[PDB]
From a paper:
The monomer core structure of LmFBPase has an α/β/α/β/α “club sandwich” topology, with two mixed β-sheets flanked by α-helices on both sides.
Co-crystallization of LmFBPase with Mn2 + and the substrate F16BP resulted in crystals in which a catalytic product Pi and manganese atoms were found in each active site. The overall conformation is very similar to the apoenzyme structure, with an RMSD value of only 1.0 Å (based on Cα atoms). The dynamic loop (residues 52–71) was found to adopt an engaged conformation, in contrast to the apoenzyme structure where the dynamic loop was found to be disordered in two of the chains. The dynamic loop of LmFBPase was found to be stabilized in an engaged conformation in the presence of inorganic phosphate and manganese. Indeed, three electron density peaks were found in each active site of this LmFBPase/Mn/Pi structure; anomalous difference maps calculated from data collected at 1.89 Å (the absorption edge for Mn) showed clear peaks consistent with manganese ions at metal sites I and II. The electron density at site III is only slightly less than the electron density for the two manganese ions; however, there is no observable anomalous signal for site III, making potassium the more likely candidate. Similar coordination geometries around Mn-I and Mn-II are found in the LmFBPase crystal structures with Mn–O distances close to 2.2 Å.
Numbering used by the authors:
A (entry chain A): 8 to 59, 64 to 336
B (entry chain B): 8 to 58, 70 to 337
C (entry chain D): 7 to 21, 26 to 57, 71 to 142, 156 to 337
D (entry chain C): 7 to 21, 25 to 60, 63 to 337
C-alpha cells in the first residue's frame, strides 16, 4: 500500500475539513493523467505538430487538448469559481450551483514546441482562494479581484513533468513534495518528500542564443560564470521551463529568463508560470525574483502579464543579483 | 493493425533472407521495453537515489541477456564493461554489437531524458572470433563505414526507437498498450540549415580558440539569430537535432584532449544515423565513420548535425 | 475526448464523505487489479495470498479516507474501528476478493461492498443500506454500483487509472432463458428445486441456456446484463446456505433490486432479513423478476 | 530481473527461423486483441455489427477486429502460405515470395457472446506444415491439400485466454507450456511450464440447458455424474471453450460438446477449435475424442467441418465413452 497524493492531501487538511482542496487535486490529477496519456501516444494518434493565443503563440494540438482536459475536470470538480488558462484570452466563471472557492490559473501544457522532439514538457497551476466576503459573478468581477491579489496570497501551487516518468510536484505553504505516477494503478505516489533546493550549486540555465539582446549586467554575470578562476559552472537548458525548474529544484543551480531588447517586460507570464514556480522554489528553500525583488510580491495588473525570472539556489541567485548592483 | 518495427524489418530484408537481423532487432526491442519499464517506476522501486547508477547496471543486464539469447551475436561490447564478451559457441551469430545501454544516467533523478545507443557490425568474411583476444584484433581492422546498422532509443514522455540500415533513417514510437514499436517518423531527413546550437557553454574557458570564435559568431553575427538548447543527454539532444535541424557539439577540452564521447557505442552509431538522415558528422579530422578503431573505450570529439551548420563550424577551424 | 469518470459522476450525484469513500474503494480496486494481472510472475498464485493482499488494500485506503467509522471484512472475524480523529459516518462490510480459488485458472473474480450509514450495531437490515457495489476482475475491469437510485456500471481505463461510465442505468431484463447454478450438487438439493431445474430443461415451451462460471461476482454481473437467474440453493450439507449475508448476498441483493430484478432467500427478500451475526449465511435466488418468480412458484407447489 | 520470454523459449526449442517469426505474428495479434478487449466498453466495440459468418454466427465487432489483426500480422510474417479463419468462407493464400511453409487455421475470437458480460474469451490456432513437394498457388490447391491432412500431422497448436491475466498456452509435440502476458513490457513470460492434466478429477463441463436434445447415452452419463453413490462431481461451465478447456487442463476434469438433435454433426469446428485443443489436451496427458475416436485421427473434408468433443482427464473421458458403448 503506497502513499497516494490523494491520501497525502486528505491527511494534510484539518480533522473533517471542507474537502474542496481534495476535490480540486483530484481534478488536477485526472487532467494530468489524461494529458500524459495523450502525449505518450501522440505520434500514432496524429497529434504531433500544430493546428492549421493571447500571448501570440501559435498552438500545438496538445495545447488545445490539454486545455480542454484541465477545464473539463476543474469545472466539474465543484471547487473552482474562476479559471484562467494561458490558452484563453478571458477568464472563465464556473456556473452558479457548481461554484467553489478557488481561483486557478494554469498553463495546461508548457514547452509545447518540444513535443515533436520528445523533449520534456509540463503543466503548471497556481491556486488562490476567493477573498473572504467577495463573490465573482462575471468576467468583470474576476478582473477586478485578480488586481487586488499577490503571489503571497497563493494557497497552493504545483507542476507536472511529462518525461520518462511522470512527476507531480506541489506545495501548500508548508514545503514542497514530489510525487510520481504509478501507471499500473493511475495514482500519484509520494517519491520525493520535503524537496530542499541546495543553497549553492554550479549549474546555470538560460538561452545563450539571446546573448546579444541581454542587458550588460547579465552578459557580465554569464561571462563570470564561464571565466572566473574559483568555481567551474555547468550549463543546462532543456528549453522547457518545467523540465529546467525541476532539475533546478532537485540538483540546485540557477534558472534565468532575463530582460530582452525585444521582450522588455519579459517572456514568462506572471499568473500561470512565474508565480507558481516562484512559490514552489521559495518553499523548497530557494529564491525567486524578477526585475524588482520577489515575484510573489509583484502586483497583478492583468491575466497575461509578463515578467523576467531569476530562480534557484539562494546563493546562485544572490550572485546574479550582485551583478545587477 | 498498425505497422510494427518487426514487420518493417522483415519487409526490408530480401525474399527468404537469413533472419539473424530480425532476431537481433527483437532482442533490442525487448531490452528497450524492459529498460523503459524500469525507468518509468524507478522512483517507487528505489532505483533513483533521492533523500545514481543502478539503472546502468539493470540496463546492461537487460541488453546482454536478450542479445546473447538471440543467437544473432558473436561479440558484445558495453560501455559498462571493460572487456568485450563472446557469445557461447553454437549460440553464436554473425553480429558484433557495441552499445551504451543507458545514456545520460545522471539525468534520471531529475526526469531529464535518457536513451540507449547501439552500433552493429557484421563479422568480416573470413574471420572467426573465439576469445577476447580475437575480438580485440578484429575491432582494430574495422571502421564506422563498415557498420551495417545503428540506432538509439529515447526514454521520454513517449518512447522512441530510431534506426538505420544504410538506406535512410526511420523512427518508431512504443505503443505501451501492445508493447510494439510503431512506425511514426518514416524517412527522417535532417534539414540542411537550422539556427539551433547544442553545446555545454559552461566549458567555454577550456575550449580551443577557434571554437570559442564559432560560438561567439553564432551569438553576435548580424545576419541570423540562433537558439541554444542543451538537455545534457546526448540521445535527447541528437534526436532534437535530427528532427528540428541544428548542430550538436562536444568539442576538444583542455582536460579531455581526446574528447568526452566514446567512438564505438556513442559517436559512430550517432554518426551513421546523422549521415543517413542527410546530415554531416565529423570529429577532429573528418568523418567519424572514417576513423580507425584502436580500442573499445576510445574517445573522440563530435560536431554533428545539419550539413551547413557543421560546414560553418568547420570553417572556423581553418586555423 | 474527456470521458466521464466515476468520481465526477458521484460529485454530480450528491447535492463530501461519500466521494472520499468511493475514492478509497477505487484505489483499492485498482491496486487489487494490478496484483491479479501479474500474480503469475510475482509468485502470488499457488500452482489465497491475494485474499490477504486485497484485504490489506481495502483496509488501508478505507481507513485513511476519513469517511468510515467501522469496517468489517470477510477475512476478519472482528470488526475494526477507525481511530477517533479520523472517523466518518459509514459502516462498510466487504468481501475484498470473491472467488479466490479461481485465480490460478484465470477465471473471473471480484470484490463486493455494502455501505450503511450511522446517524451497538447489533442488527441491521439490508433495507437501510445506503450504497452497494462490486468490482469484476476480468478481461476488462468493471465497477458496478448503486446508491438507491438505480445501478450504473463503470470500466477501468488502464491508460489513466480512472473508472469511466460505460453501462449507465443497468436494467436487468424481466425475463431471460439463462440459469446459473452448480448442478454437480443435484442430489443434495430440496425436491422442489430439483423439479424447477428439470422443468427448465424438459419444458416444451422455452429453451434455457446454462452458465456457471463459479464466481459469484462474475455470474451476477452476467445475470444483471444479460438477464437470467443465479441460484445458491439450500444444501443437505449447508442447510443455512453457502453465501454470507452481510458482505455477499445483501450488497448483491440491493444491486439486483435497483436494476429491476428480484433477490430472495429462504423466506422472502434478502434485504428484509435480520442480521444476527457477522458471518451469517443464506441461500440466494437472484435475477430477472419473472425467472425468480418461476423458481419460487415451484417452492410454493 | 530478465525473465524468460515466449520468443526466447521458442528460439531455444529450435535446432531456420520461420516458426519464430510465426510465433511473433501470433503474439502481436494476441496483444492487439487483448488491447481492444480491455477498452472495448469505452471505444464502442461492445456488442455486434448491424447487418452471419460461414458457420451461421452473427458476428461481434471484436470478431472482425480480431480477424483483421491475425491476418495482418500472419501474412506480413513471411511464414505462412495459407490461412483459414472461422470468420472467412474461403482460405486465403499469401502473395508469392511473401509465402512461407505454414498453413494456419484459427479462431481469432472464441466466446464472442461473452464479452458484453466480461466473461473470458480466447483465440485458438492450429499449425500444419505444407507437405513435402506440394505447392499451394490458389484456393483450389489449398482445398485439395487440407483434404489429405489429419490432426496427427499438426506441428503446433495453441490458444490465448483473455481474462484478468492474459495467458498463451502452446505445444509443438513435446508437451504443453503456458505463458502470461507482462503488460509492462508486452512480452509473454513462461509461468506454467510442462502442464500436465490430471488423470482423474471430479469436474464436468457442459451446457445442461440442452439436456433434452442430447442422445440417451449422454443423458445417462450426466445423470450418473450427479446420482452415483461413490464419487461427487462439481459442475463448471463458463461458456467459453478456451476458458473451460484452460480450467480443464490445469484442474483436470471433462469438457463436452456432445451431439445435438439440431447440430447432428456438432457445434465445434474441426480445423480451428477441436483439433488444436485436441493436440494441446493430448500433449498435456489427456484424451480428446469425438464421435468415432481421436479428433486428431479424423479426416478433414472441408474448412468449416464440425465435430462433437469429449476432452479432458483420460479416466473421465474413458468413463464418458463407457456409457456410449453400453
Ligand atoms: K504556449
Ligand atoms: K561517462
Ligand atoms: K473473500
Ligand atoms: K463466432
Ligand atoms: Mn502552454
Ligand atoms: Mn509555458
Ligand atoms: Mn551510459
Ligand atoms: Mn477468503
Ligand atoms: Mn466471498
Ligand atoms: Mn470459437
Amino acid at each position: 500500500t503506497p502513499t497516494t497524493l490523494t491520501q497525502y492531501i486528505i491527511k494534510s487538511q484539518p480533522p473533517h475539513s471542507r474537502g474542496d482542496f481534495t476535490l480540486l487535486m483530484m481534478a488536477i490529477q485526472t487532467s494530468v493523467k489524461v494529458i500524459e496519456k495523450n502525449i505518450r501516444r501522440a505520434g500514432m494518434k496524429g497529434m504531433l505538430g500544430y493546428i492549421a493565443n493571447a500571448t501570440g503563440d501559435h498552438q500545438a494540438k496538445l495545447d488545445v487538448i490539454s486545455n480542454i482536459a484541465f477545464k473539463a475536470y476543474l469545472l466539474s470538480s465543484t471547487s473552482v469559481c474562476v479559471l484562467g488558462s494561458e490558452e484563453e484570452e478571458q477568464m472563465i466563471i464556473a456556473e452558479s450551483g457548481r461554484r467553489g472557492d478557488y481561483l486557478i490559473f494554469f498553463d495546461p501544457l508548457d514547452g509545447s514546441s518540444n513535443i515533436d522532439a520528445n523533449v520534456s514538457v509540463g503543466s503548471i497551476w497556481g491556486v488562490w482562494r476567493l477573498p473572504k466576503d467577495t463573490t465573482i459573478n462575471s468576467v468583470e468581477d474576476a478582473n477586478a479581484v485578480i488586481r487586488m491579489l499577490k503571489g503571497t496570497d497563493m494557497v497552493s501551487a504545483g507542476y507536472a513533468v511529462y518525461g520518462s516518468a511522470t512527476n507531480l510536484v506541489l506545495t501548500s505553504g508548508h514545503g514542497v513534495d514530489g510525487f510520481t505516477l504509478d501507471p499500473n494503478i493511475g495514482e500519484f505516489i509520494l517519491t520525493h518528500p520535503h524537496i530542499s533546493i541546495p543553497k549553492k550549486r554550479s549549474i546555470y540555465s538560460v538561452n545563450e542564443g539571446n546573448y546579444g539582446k541581454w542587458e550588460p549586467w547579465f552578459k557580465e554575470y554569464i561571462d563570470y560564470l564561464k571565466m572566473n578562476k574559483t568555481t567551474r559552472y555547468s550549463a543546462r537548458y532543456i528549453g522547457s521551463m518545467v523540465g529546467d525548474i525541476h532539475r533546478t529544484l532537485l540538483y540546485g543551480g540557477i534558472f534565468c529568463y532575463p530582460k530582452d531588447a525585444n521582450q522588455v517586460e519579459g517572456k514568462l507570464r506572471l499568473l500561470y508560470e512565474a508565480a507558481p514556480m516562484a512559490m514552489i522554489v521559495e518553499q523548497a528553500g530557494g529564491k525567486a525574483v524578477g526585475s524588482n525583488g520577489r515575484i510573489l510580491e509583484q502586483s497583478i495588473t492583468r491575466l497575461h502579464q509578463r515578467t523576467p525570472v531569476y530562480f534557484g539556489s539562494r546563493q546562485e541567485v544572490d550572485l546574479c543579483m550582485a551583478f545587477r548592483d
